[model samples]
Target: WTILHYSPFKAVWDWLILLLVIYTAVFTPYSAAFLCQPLAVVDLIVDIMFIVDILINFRTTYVNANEEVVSHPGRIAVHYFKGWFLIDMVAAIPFDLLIGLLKTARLLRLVRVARKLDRYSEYGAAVLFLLMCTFALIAHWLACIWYAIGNMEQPIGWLHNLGDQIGKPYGGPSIKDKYVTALYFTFSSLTSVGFGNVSPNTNSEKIFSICVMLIGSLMYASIFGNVSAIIQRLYSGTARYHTQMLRVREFIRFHQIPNPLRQRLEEYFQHAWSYTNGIDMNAVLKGFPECLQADICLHLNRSLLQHCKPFRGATKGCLRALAMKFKTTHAPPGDTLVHAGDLLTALYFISRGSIEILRGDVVVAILGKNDIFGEPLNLYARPGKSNGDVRALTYCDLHKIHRDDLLEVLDMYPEFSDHFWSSLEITFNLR
Candidate 1:
């Protein structure tokens, strides 16, 4: 739709645009003097993409200075017009020839684009990356002036001086060589590496040389005041997910869990991590029919579910069905899960951690891992309502099932349905 703001996908899209924007700007900084050379399919793709971005921004919304997000139509247009659109215009226009050297603003644009993508404590490697890009841009423009200096006079200028030094005529090496020489002189000047060979001969060139030397002094001395860093997490890459995937390779190799099934389970974790914000296990499993999904589910939760006394001898079909119903919800310590005087509409099976059932200082029981609280989820009478305050003593991984779901499942298995109710009354009251 409207390219919803600042999601993983949105951040991904911006990342692509940032790289492309940096490319051929700093990338082609050397390529500028020789305008006719067309290098890669990258050229066409980048040109079209920027134009596409221009159109997309007209529809995409903005984050206001007050930190409010604006998401509607004409306001987006007005806001886009005021900020960033014109800069994109010069940078975005498909003038492959002239715009090559005019990309100084793109670095400033890169940092600002980087600013909105994510915020940090401003102290990582990526912050110093700006230092690298700044040098590239200055050399980029300084190379710009360097070419102009060479272009101004044939014998007196640096290119002429370059060709003479190499013992070749003006028609000599490729235009690329000229580009290289231009950048070489620029970097050599900016770094103040005045090797007597490539020294600037004339006053026009010498003036440019001294200015570059002075500029280099600041960057070399204080690192251009070493601008305060904005450390974007360079660690935030797909590399972490791939490492986990590799770990699972050891998993299958060691246990040798049925090869195909092992592959399926591996992908389940793979599919899980690729998307942030937890994906519903139910939704993912439904990609297959319920029979297969339920079977896999039971296999996953087999130990905890079977070890719990109430579910000890559940039928294969019903046990698998029950397994599919479970969802992992870890109740952290001091969680306000169960209300003392309200309906207990959900059953929590403690697959892990200590959950304390109590009313303030009054202790009911301390339930640990592998305990199923309610087999049939009976709400034992009320005090104005039924009462029992429950909280976590440690981070508790509670697998929950809604009463409506268990009702639907148990109705299909009378054996499970009857025994579950018996277990609930006996076990809960036994406490």
Candidate 2:
């Protein structure tokens, strides 16, 4: 028992049996030349070992040391042993009875062992089993049909009687011959090996054979190549798309443009945008070229401070001083500086000319030079809502810059910060 459990001979025995069972079940169906008599006996011994292993393992789990079988009461009890017991017995008993004492040929026992292959996890096992079953059924049907046809010409009963007298089964064909022929036909159909030693005789059989051939071809392609290719696509395809979206979103953020602008660029990327020029990184940077420093310098000028008094006083002066950069734009009469509802980034100082604030068709206010038009609006602007539109009534110029941009530039340029605080003190009339 110790040797059986842990020795090299036992391991070799088990492996040999496993290999033979697999080989016989798969390869023997294609060619019987591999099934020499000694190998057949080895195959029988392997089948015995498989059945014994199953039974011994089952007994160990479900029976006590004294041999009393334990029983459960629910679905688990049913699952513990039902079909498996029957299949195990069926796979083993035929060979157990046929060894040495009977001339009944042990191939049927191998057939039973082959049928138990439905329990395998490997997908290839299922395919091989189906191939074997198809071959067997086709062979049996053709043999019965042939025997009947030949019997109509010569009496099969007399042939059987004569063969029995000579110690044969019937006519000149033995079980081995029929089995080998069936397997040959089956494998030939499976592998597209159309040798024509055996073929479908009837139109219905011919159609069935053709269908099986087509199914076999497709199965070969799916299992061998197509499925693997599709699995690779599923894993790698999503990754490719994700990497592309990441690069695109990064480019948009770097240029300080919104997603809508980026989306439009992506749409136009394929048409009239010849790759010959490639992408201009400088052009992308130019989109947000003017920094807050320039805007802050314009706001600091004495002309802007004097012309716009509301913006020049103590509270407003402190803010202007802190602003690191500013932009000054001039709008002539009847010119639209900004629409009624647009996102704005900067405060506007009305240094010159007259301007009107409008809501649709209504003009809410009109102002001349030195008046502040955008202070109150800028202090209160939210994400999407606008107070009104600021348009020039005459030739008007305004100084403007972003609040956040000003702060960022100020943090980087300390000289601007010092000058800004000093100017604030002068504007506020502080000692």
Candidate 3:
């Protein structure tokens, strides 16, 4: 039950069902009579899978806004009923039981694909997939409508006029060719880029073109609006930085600060903004549950933490707890991170640039790229002091875990605490 609910199995089924739906959609219009039986068999299998999905939805747990998983059957059933249950039920119905036109309801299965898009890491990719699906559905529908118009004998409306010159020199000859031609016309009308090589010749055809053109205009507006919103959301941090910079410039001008000092301040802010993209990750994580926050941090820091002896054999829970404590900081060149005899209250893990350990005026050690410092702080007692000055030699990216947070994590996993302390003593030669 747990494996079915939480594993990649669900995603695998989702993609498989999506592929099946697409194949059915494409082949249904063009397929010969003999192929109907096999297709029906495949659809039967697909319907069974959808039925199983509904059962899973009924019993599976769901995550609440508070980040707790609700497993009560009543709650799970209620949540399902409130959302996609009806759609899923409609999609699962056997098409054989319905009249020819009613079988189109099976296409609703494609809606299930939208639920799987969140698994994609980038929203841009999800949007692209949605666009492709929409275009395919539109093309499929246009082909079906073209076929329907071609089969009608009476020349009463403008729709019959569409078939008048369809098989002419510049037009389609066979059913397949007509389908392709309809797709071409549909795309041309939708994009409002009618090439004039193939155009509507009658009132009906003209009216249909106008309807397609209007729909195309609306589609373009909706797509562009969504794209604009996504771009604005992503660059909100950059926009805020620009706004604050303008405010700072006004302040400096009002106070009549010296040009040289103002220039330096502006330059510093530019560098800071460039490094961070004006985002505070700690603040962002504060909005998420501790477990989710810890998971995100683990992904960002696992590579660096993997090289640290104390964390090499830590349990996943301990690692997640430790990850939640890490805070990212930046230091410009020539900035002192810690002076000699300062309290060793945090462990520093260097992710980028370089740091120099100095004894008085002489450089004793240099650290960069996955190197760590202040290791003994959380492991030992009484000797709570830095041995030498640590200064940034270049723009440095550091992840710091405070002693108190580290202690709390250690308390959560006593075995890991013992292992970490043993490694610390061996590595640092601590008595």
Candidate 4:
């Protein structure tokens, strides 16, 4: 009733049935077995409610005012006639037929909802890790049980006892004792801190323990490491997930691509994978799904970053020389640092302050500390009469390097091209 009041008919019925199946499964250690009886009654009521809702909403398709609603009557009718619809009805048929079904096992069907919910939150990752651990635990328990229940001539209808032999001699245990021992062995194997006080004496038991340890270690490492990496990046504001997504979107925009085409682009990169060496672009292009050349261009950008070399050796010296040789100057507040038709004889660097350049009232560039200005245009000038001007945005310390001297230094040290080319990439409009 609460569901019908607050949720739509479809959602209410789906969730109700889903809950019914879950409660029928293995209860927690403290749960009462009798609780499921009342739940079964509620499940019956929910089923009736669902049938009634379906009949009523059969008319839903006849009226469609919004894109959210289905407008085709045939499509609405087809919904209840599909395999999924039939499967749902079949899920409850055993109860309707009065044959007692092992409904606790059937409860696992509810895992589908957990899978759906996982798409929206981080908890899903934790759930997945827990599931893997649980599976390993179950395997260990089963192996322990099987190994303990060794072959022995037994009377008909007699449950083989295993506990009776634990301290006595070999093995013969009751159900309760066997279950306790199995759980103890399972947990020990899972934690991988197994106390050798209780050892696996059988081959089957040893193999089972190994399986549990392997699964437990891998699951724990993957979950903990991934979560830690995600949290660390979040705190440091350096997580690349969003930036990577932005890059993917940029690729999409560049190629005017759709989802399938984008997926193929990703697939191509995957196929070109190499562990010993880095990615191979030629291989990626050869295997690529789409004919879009934009992927090649984007691949080039990524490749550049992959192989980028920071200035080193002679290049570093050249950069330092360029930075320090420039004469330090200051521009007072509200004073023009440079202007239109100003003679361009030097390149300026921002040593400790900011400058704003304007040409005929149009702001061109804003230079800050460590930023170089006036080099690109200066290079373009041929025996220049004059070029543009620069101004200080605040009381600033500027470093000015004579253009002739800087050029002479660059000419003498051919290795400066590495640093110069990198700077040019940022300053010039490469496109």
Local accuracy of candidate 2 as per-residue lDDT tens digits, 1-431:
11222335544554455455545454433333212487567656666776676554443223345645443333224555665455445445543321232312223434544543443425534554555554554444433333333344443333343345446664565656544554566557757889865666544556667776786677566555644565566666666555665786687779888766555566444321232134443355345434533343433455544543344443443443444344456544544655534665565555556666666666654666545444332235463444566655676565676756654654654554555545432211100
Q: Evaluate residue 137 in candidate 3 and report its C-alpha lDDT on the 0 to 100 scale.
A: 72
Better of 1 and 2 by lDDT: 1
* Candidate 3 per-residue lDDT over residues 136-236, each given as its tens digit: 67756765664455445222332334445553442325555556666777777777787765676556656666776787789867877887777787687
Q: For model 4, what is the error of residue 68's alpha carbon versus the real structure, in angstroms, after optimal superposition?
A: 9.9
Cα RMSD to the true fold for all candidates? 15.8, 20.9, 9.0, 18.5
List runs of model 2 lying over 4 Å from the truth. 1-20, 27-37, 59-79, 95-205, 217-226, 233-238, 245-431
Clash count for candidate 3 is 1
Clashes by residue pair, model 3 = 158-204
Report backbone clashes per prediction. Answer: 2, 6, 1, 10
Q: Which stretches of candidate 1 lie over 4 Å from their true place?
A: 27-31, 36-44, 94-123, 224-431
Task: Estimate the TM-score of every prediction.
Answer: 0.46, 0.30, 0.55, 0.36
Model 4, 1-431: lDDT tens per residue?
A: 11222246645555564455444333311022111586566556645654554466455543234545454456667654753454344444434442233443344454545534543255535554555544553544344443344322232111222333365333355455545555565566666767654565656556655766787677667766766775675554433544554676687789888776566566433332322133344576566544333344332222123222443333334444443344555444444554444555666555556766655576665656545455454346543432345555775556667777876776666556646565453331210
List the pairs of residues colliding in candidate 2. Answer: 292-325, 295-325, 295-326, 295-327, 296-325, 296-326
lDDT per residue, candidate 1, 140-236, as tens digits? 7788767766776653556667778777876675677777777787787777776666677888878777788888887766764544312223343
The window of 10 residues in a row where model 4 has the poorest summed lDDT is 26-35
Q: What lDDT does each candidate get?
A: 0.64, 0.50, 0.65, 0.49
lDDT of 2: 0.50
